[PDB]
């Protein structure tokens, strides 16, 4: 070999040392959102029992049978709220991933003739306690978890039935 080969080797070493990386932040965000999904999954029993025994969905945590929203918190979750049978969990505002800072995800259920189906995805809202339909959460806010930061199973539209 000669000096040109050594210079090319050094250049290739620099190229390898200055390479780019894929987006691992999305995977970390999914891992963190899994905790919120698990936390929100625990309030299903009380809501279902209230609906079965009273004929209408609970309107708040007070008569759902659960604690306050600010008390249901984890390492990455700051609040979980129940409104008209819809469970919404919010992320923390600091010491978390940048992409999922202060964003919300929702869980809701629809009654069938022989079963009760549960859905998970972007935030939704139910107007009346006796309604069977849901719509988008709000048109004047940006607190929505992006599709890329959710599992493939937890991606449902408000029109799903």
């Amino acid at each position, epitope marked *: 070999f000669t000096l040109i080969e050594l210079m090319i080797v050094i250049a290739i070493v620099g190229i390898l040392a200055a390479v780019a990386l894929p987006a691992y932040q999305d995977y970390t965000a999914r891992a963190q959102v899994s905790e919120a999904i698990l936390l929100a999954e625990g309030q299903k029993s009380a809501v279902t029992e209230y609906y079965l025994n009273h004929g*209408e969905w609970p*309107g*708040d945590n*007070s*008569s759902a049978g659960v604690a306050t929203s600010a008390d249901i918190k984890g390492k990455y979750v700051q609040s979980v709220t129940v*409104a*008209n049978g819809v469970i919404t969990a919010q992320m923390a505002s600091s010491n978390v991933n940048n992409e999922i800072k202060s964003k919300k995800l929702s869980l809701w259920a629809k009654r069938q003739n022989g079963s009760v189906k549960w859905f998970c995805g972007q935030p939704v*809202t*139910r*107007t*009346t*306690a*006796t309604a069977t339909d849901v*719509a988008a959460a*709000n048109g*004047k806010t940006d607190d929505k978890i992006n599709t890329k930061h959710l599992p493939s199973t937890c991606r449902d539209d408000s029109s799903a039935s």
Partner: nanobody
Amino acid sequence: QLQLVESGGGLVQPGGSLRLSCAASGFTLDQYAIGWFRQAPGKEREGVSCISSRGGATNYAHSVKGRFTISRDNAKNTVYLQMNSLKPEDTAVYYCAAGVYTIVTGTGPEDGMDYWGKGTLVTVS
């Protein structure tokens, strides 16, 4: 039949306070949810606040959150709405309705109410 009468309207300077009251005569309001609605001049009617039958569930609108407070009394069939830090944009006609519990930030808030009131006029200078 059931009739709703509102009271407490008037004129209040900006930065002041006002209290409303929606009450019924001859009937008991214990199995119904009381909600407040506001209609601006030349604008469609919207929702402000709503309270549950047993006074444990409350929800307010985005613009009025933090400044309005809703309370319910069961010994006397009356519902109170406290207004604080008034603004010129809050001048409108206020209504009170009874029916099923509703979220004031959803599509068609009026679909769950079966009783209505005449309404009162509130003006902010």
